[PDB]
């Protein structure tokens, strides 16, 4: 009832009791482990109050007035509003608490040492896609901060019935378009090919190039989504160069500075926020390794190896690995030379071990998903590879949710 996780590079041992508070299920059983399954899988007023109570008990405990007067009043207050309205509404302070702890509890996030430095934008007063666009631009401007990136989340109105849902249809606020060609191959980002075509289906006019920043497709209160183009001056970009290889500029690559996922769902006290774009900053490998060198992505290991003068004949010449490291030196170098916030997989993973310590001390644990925490290159030369991690689901939390075009009733 008090589990042990060990680091096999420092012999450090930490004891986990936080998993006790766990509640949601993981997909694993006693006889099958699903820790490498990518996605493992309206709400009534009965279910809603334990969840509100649970949440409120930790919120007041966190400001050191658990079970007190102001607590039991709010517990009663929310009880009454759930009877009356069949749902309820979070205080501004409760929303900011919930959000930050949804991030704190994100077991796949290696960035959580920053979880308490999160700027919460309350867009729960929003009613239209244009208001969403306006809130999102302000999010993008604020979080970017001229390259001194700041973490932020904008939280649109909670789901109510279910047919009234606020959704950002983009998977990230800033994404490069993907177009398939006549010869099957893909210009731009292959990951977004279907979304890029949804934007054209609803009206986008595509500059059919590479790094074309997609428009926002914004759905408000269940209505059909509408297209908006982020003012380009708000979309900060780092052109990627290499600190030794001047042919690297000729590759003509760039990436946006601001990673902001917008397709996820924030759960706080049983309430569901289907549109809650959050941004922080990139770890280099997300761009250099996955974005650039995934096969079903920009897939540039071919060209970079070529220009490097590489033995591409034999698999075992590690030409793929060799080009992979150069691409990531270039990503980091480029971003830092432009004073755009980026972290390398070594700093980020040491910080996560440091974060893990603090959590086990002042919280009794840290849910962590090794499969996702270990960076996609140079696994074992980073301290998280050697760190045992217990994965369990705590709430408040960020959840996967269906793509809104699979679920929506159009017209």
Ligand X SMILES: N=C(Nc1ccc(CCNCc2cccc(NC(=N)c3ccco3)c2)cc1)c1ccco1
Ligand Y SMILES: C[C@H](O)[C@H](O)[C@H]1CNc2nc(N)[nH]c(=O)c2N1
115 as an active site residue: the answer is no
Rounded to 10 degrees, what is the CA torsion of 350, 285, 404, 104?
A: 10
Kindly tell me which residue out of 348, 353, 377, 384 binds ligand HEM, with binding defined by CB under 6 A: 348
Which residues, 6+ apart, have CB-to-CB distance to 324 below 8 Å? 288, 289, 293, 301, 377
Of 33 and 70, the one with the shorter C-beta distance to Zn ion is 33
Task: Give CA–CA dist 42/159, Å, rounded.
Answer: 8
137 as an active site residue: the answer is no
Task: Give CA–CA dist 303/327, Å, rounded.
Answer: 11
Stretches 206-214, 223-231, 297-305, 383-391: which one binds ligand Y (CB under 6 A)?
383-391
Task: Give CA–CA dist 295/36, Å, rounded.
Answer: 19
| Interaction between residue 12 and its own copies (CB under 8 A) | no
Phi-psi region of 391 (alpha: psi -120 to 50; beta: other; left: phi over 0): beta
The answer to whether the beta carbons of residues 268 and 95 sit under 8 Å apart is yes
- Binding partner of residue 280 among ligand Y, ligand HEM, Zn ion, none, CB cut-off 5 to 8 Å per kind: ligand HEM
- Find the catalytic residue in 159, 281, 293, 319: 281
- Find the catalytic residue in 104, 109, 204, 255: 109
Give 15's DSSP letter.
E
Kindly tell me which residue out of 55, 166, 169, 372 binds ligand Y, with binding defined by CB under 6 A: 372
- Binding partner of residue 260 among ligand X, its own copies, ligand HEM, none, CB cut-off 5 to 8 Å per kind: ligand X
- Binding partner of residue 8 among Zn ion, ligand HEM, ligand X, none, CB cut-off 5 to 8 Å per kind: ligand X
Reference 151, options 124, 123, 114, 122; nearest CA is 114
User: Least CB distance from residue 167 to ligand X, whole Å?
Assistant: 16
DSSP per residue over 310-342, as a string? ---S-GGG-HHHHHHHHHHHHHHHHHHHTT--E
- Find the catalytic residue in 94, 103, 112, 204: 112
User: Least CB distance from residue 320 to ligand Y, whole Å?
Assistant: 17
| Interaction between residue 385 and its own copies (CB under 8 A) | yes
Give the pairing type, strands 282-283 and 342-343: parallel
Which helix (DSSP H) or strand (DSSP E) does residue 74 occupy?
helix 69-85
| Interaction between residue 278 and ligand X (CB under 6 A) | yes
Which residues, 6+ apart, have CB-to-CB distance to 232 below 8 Å? 213
| Interaction between residue 110 and ligand HEM (CB under 6 A) | yes
Burial class for 32, CB neighbours closer than 10 Å (0-12, 13-18, 19+) = exposed
Task: Give CA–CA dist 55/74, Å, rounded.
Answer: 11
Kindly tell me which residue out of 4, 8, 127, 207 binds ligand Y, with binding defined by CB under 6 A: 8
112 as an active site residue: the answer is yes
Which helix (DSSP H) or strand (DSSP E) does residue 292 occupy?
helix 292-293
Site string for ligand X, 17-56 (x = CB under 6 A): ---------------------x------------------
Distance, CA of 233 to chain centre: 23
Task: Give CA–CA dist 258/282, Å, rounded.
Answer: 7
333 is in an annotated binding site: no
126 as an active site residue: the answer is no
Could you list the active site residues? Answer: 109, 112, 281, 286
What residues line the site for ligand HEM (CB under 6 A)?
A: 103, 106, 108-111, 114, 118, 151, 153, 278, 280-281, 283, 286, 343, 348, 372, 398
The site for ligand X (CB under 6 A) is made up of 8, 38, 111, 259-261, 278-280, 282, 286, 294, 296
Known binding residues for heme b are 109, 400
Q: Detail the residues annotated as belonging to a binding site for L-arginine.
A: 172, 281-282, 286
Residues that bind its own copies (CB under 8 A): 3, 5-6, 8-9, 19, 22-38, 284, 289-290, 293-296, 301, 315-318, 320-322, 324-326, 328-329, 332, 336, 344, 346-347, 369-371, 374-381, 385, 388-393
Binding site feature residues = 36, 109, 172, 281-282, 286, 371-372, 385, 400
């Amino acid at each position: 009832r008090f589990l042990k996780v060990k680091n096999w590079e420092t012999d450090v041992v930490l004891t986990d009791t936080l998993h006790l508070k766990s509640t949601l299920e993981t997909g694993c059983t006693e006889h099958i482990c699903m820790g490498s399954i990518m996605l493992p899988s309206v709400a009534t007023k009965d279910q809603l109050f334990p969840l509100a109570k649970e949440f409120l008990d930790q919120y007041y405990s966190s400001i050191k007035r658990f079970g007190s007067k102001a607590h039991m009043d709010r517990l009663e207050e929310v009880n009454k509003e759930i009877e009356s309205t069949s749902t309820y509404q979070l205080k501004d302070t409760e929303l900011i608490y919930g959000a930050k702890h949804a991030w704190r509890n994100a077991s796949r996030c290696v960035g959580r040492i920053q979880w308490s430095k999160l700027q919460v934008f309350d867009a729960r007063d929003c009613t239209t896609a244009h208001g969403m666009f306006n809130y999102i631009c302000n999010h993008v401007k604020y979080a970017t901060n001229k390259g001194n990136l700041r973490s932020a989340i904008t939280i649109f109105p909670q789901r109510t019935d279910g047919k009234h849902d606020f959704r950002v249809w983009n998977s990230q606020l800033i994404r490069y378009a993907g177009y398939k060609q006549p010869d099957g191959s893909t210009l731009g980002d292959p990951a977004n090919v279907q979304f890029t075509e949804i934007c054209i289906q609803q009206g986008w006019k595509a500059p059919r190039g590479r790094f074309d920043v997609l428009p926002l497709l914004l759905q408000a209160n269940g209505n059909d989504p509408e297209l908006f183009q982020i003012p380009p001056e708000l979309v900060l970009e780092v052109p990627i160069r290499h600190p030794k290889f001047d042919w690297f500029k000729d590759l003509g690559l760039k990436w946006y500075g601001l990673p902001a996922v917008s397709n996820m769902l924030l759960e706080i006290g049983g309430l569901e926020f289907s549109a809650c774009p959050f941004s922080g900053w990139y770890m280099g490998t997300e761009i250099g390794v996955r974005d650039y060198c995934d096969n079903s992505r920009y897939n540039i290991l071919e060209e970079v190896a070529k220009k490097m003068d590489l033995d591409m004949r034999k698999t075992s010449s590690l030409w793929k690995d060799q080009a992979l490291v150069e691409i990531n030196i270039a990503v980091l170098y480029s971003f830092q030379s432009d004073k755009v916030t980026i972290v390398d997989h070594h700093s980020a993973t040491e910080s996560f071990i440091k974060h893990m310590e603090n959590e086990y001390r002042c919280r009794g644990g840290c849910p962590a998903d090794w499969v996702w925490i270990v960076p996609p290159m140079s696994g074992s030369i980073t301290p998280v590879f050697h760190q045992e991690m217990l994965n369990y689901r705590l709430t408040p939390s960020f959840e996967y949710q269906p793509d809104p075009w699979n679920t929506h009733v159009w017209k």
